Amino acid sequence: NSNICEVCNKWGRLFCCDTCPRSFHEHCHIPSVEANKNPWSCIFCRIKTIQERCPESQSGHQESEVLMRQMLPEEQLKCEFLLLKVYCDSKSCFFASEPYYNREGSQGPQKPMWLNKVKTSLNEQMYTRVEGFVQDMRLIFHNHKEFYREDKFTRLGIQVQDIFEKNFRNIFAIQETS
Numbered sequence: 001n002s003n004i005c006e007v008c009n010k011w012g013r014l015f016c017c018d019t020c021p022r023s024f025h026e027h028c029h030i031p032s033v034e035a036n037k038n039p040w041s042c043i044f045c046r047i048k049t050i051q052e053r054c055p056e057s058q059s060g061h062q063e064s065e066v067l068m069r070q071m072l073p074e075e076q077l078k079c080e081f082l083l084l085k086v087y088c089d090s091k092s093c094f095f096a097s098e099p100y101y102n103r104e105g106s107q108g109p110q111k112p113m114w115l116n117k118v119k120t121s122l123n124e125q126m127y128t129r130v131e132g133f134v135q136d137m138r139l140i141f142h143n144h145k146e147f148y149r150e151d152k153f154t155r156l157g158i159q160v161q162d163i164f165e166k167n168f169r170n171i172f173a174i175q176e177t178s
């Protein structure tokens with residue numbers, strides 16, 4: 001197994017995957033690493049297993065179809081992985097915890113959103129469709145772009161949103177387009 005956390009890349013109290021070499025802090029893994037279970041498979045392993053069980057799940061899809069899907073256990077997992085992949089980027093640290101807004105010439109967003117809030121929402125099963133998860137994810141970056149305006153700090157929003165969108169297309173097998 002790896003000696004660092006796959007998500008944050010630090011050492012510490014790590015839990016090791018029994019089916020691949022990745023390791024996780026308890027709360028870096030989404031969902032949080034499970035109390036017992038021997039062996040234990042990580043979320044990278046569980047996502048691979050869905051794909052292997054239905055190779056046609058990697059033929060292309062329409063985003064509109066994807067969003068209307070109900071949050072049954074496989075869609076739930078896939079959003080928990082998408083979220084995980086965003087937290088793998090160190091720049092996710094700017095979007096993790098609840099923000100606040102006090103900048104001359106800007107008003108704060110009507111509906112603030114942050115990654116830990118999206119994490120809690122998933123955990124408490126508050127999304128019924130993929131749509132709900134993907135709207136909040138996108139809201140994070142949109143709020144950021146609107147608030148920081150012409151400041152160069154807006155670019156962090158663009159960057160982390162590009163990580164979200166590439167990963168969403170991949171995980172949900174969106175049909176490739178030019």
Ligand SMILES: [Zn+2]
Pocket residue numbers: 005006007008009010024025028
């Ligand atoms: Zn970690």
Ligand SMILES: [Zn+2]
Pocket residue numbers: 017018019020021022041042043044045
């Ligand atoms: Zn694994």
Ligand SMILES: [Zn+2]
Pocket residue numbers: 053054055
């Ligand atoms: Zn099949």
